[PDB]
Amino acid sequence: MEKNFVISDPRLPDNPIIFASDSFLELTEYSREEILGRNCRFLQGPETDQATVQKIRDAIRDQREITVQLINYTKSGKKFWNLFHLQPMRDQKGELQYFIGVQLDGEFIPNPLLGL
Ligand SMILES: Cc1cc2nc3c(=O)[nH]c(=O)nc-3n(C[C@H](O)[C@H](O)[C@H](O)COP(=O)(O)O)c2cc1C
């Protein structure tokens, strides 16, 4: 199955990417060496809704799952809608270990309705 996802380590500064799937690199047009060690906010750009970004920030803080749809950008500046799902991962002791983020490319929710 095709699967776009990245894994970050929130126990390192600014929650860097430590793994990115091959399909994620295909979707975003970045190479792995460009991405490792970066926060995934590099996919955002001028048309990204800051109110939606704030929902993600809150979800990270509370370590809760969240799904939002937002505009992201490829390396070449192509805009794509991203139905983005964030999932905390905990170790056996219940301590946060990783976050996984999964991206689905498509305008699933029409933008006029998303605007509401
Ligand atoms: C594992 C993971 C994957 C993420 N994937 C995306 C993504 O695909 N697109 C996106 O716009 N933001 C993504 N983010 C969110 C940004 O990295 C960042 O958390 C968000 O912009 C809010 O934090 P900031 O206000 O410090 O930028 C992801 C975050 C994590 C932890």
UniProtKB/Swiss-Prot annotation:
Function: Protein kinase that acts as a blue light photoreceptor in a signal-transduction pathway for photo-induced movements. Triggers the phosphorylation of AHA1 and AHA2 C-terminal penultimate Thr in guard cells to activate them and induce stomatal opening in response to blue light (BL). Also phosphorylates BLUS1, a kinase involved in stomatal opening. Mediates calcium spiking of extra- and intracellular origins in response to blue light. Involved in hypocotyl phototropism.
Record domain PAS: where: 2-63
UniProt-annotated binding residues for FMN 2: N39, R41, Q44, R57, N72, N82, F84, Q103
UniProt miscellaneous comment: Undergoes a photocycle characterized by fluorescence and absorption changes induced by blue light. Half-time of photoproduct formation is 11 seconds and 15 seconds for dark regeneration.
Coiled-coil annotated residue ranges, if any: none
Name used for this protein in its record: Phototropin-2
Subunit details: Homodimer. Interacts with PKS1, PKS2, RPT3 and PHOT1. Associates with CBC1 and CBC2. Binds to BHP.
Signal peptide: none
Domain observations: The activation loop within the kinase domain is the target of phosphorylation. The PAS (PER-ARNT-SIM) domains are required for the binding of FMN chromophores.
Biotech relevance: The flavoproteins improved LOV (iLOVs) are fluorescent flavoproteins engineered from PHOT2 by improving its photostability and brighteness, and which maybe used as oxygen-independent fluorescent reporters with a small size. The iLOVs are PHOT2 fragments (385-496) and contain many amino-acid substitutions relative to cv. Columbia, to confer different properties in term of stablity, brightness and color.
PTM comment text: Autophosphorylated in response to blue light irradiation.
Organism of derivation: Arabidopsis thaliana (Mouse-ear cress)
Organ and tissue specificity: Expressed in leaves, stems and flowers, and to a lower extent in roots. Present in guard cells (at protein level).
Family the entry assigns: Belongs to the protein kinase superfamily. AGC Ser/Thr protein kinase family.
Subcellular location(s) of the protein: Cell membrane
Traits of the deletion mutant: Plants lacking both PHOT1 and PHOT2 have curled downward leaves missing color changes and lower petiole angles in response to weak or strong blue light (BL). Impaired proton H(+) pumping associated with altered increased ATP hydrolysis and absence of binding between 14-3-3 protein and H(+)-ATPase (e.g. AHA1 and AHA2) in response to BL in guard cells of plants missing PHOT1 and PHOT2.
Domain PAC, residue spans: 64-106
Chain positions with S-4a-FMN cysteine modification: C40
Shown stretch of the complete protein: 388 to 492 of 915
Gene: PHOT2
Expression induction: Light fluence rate-dependent induction, independent of light quality.
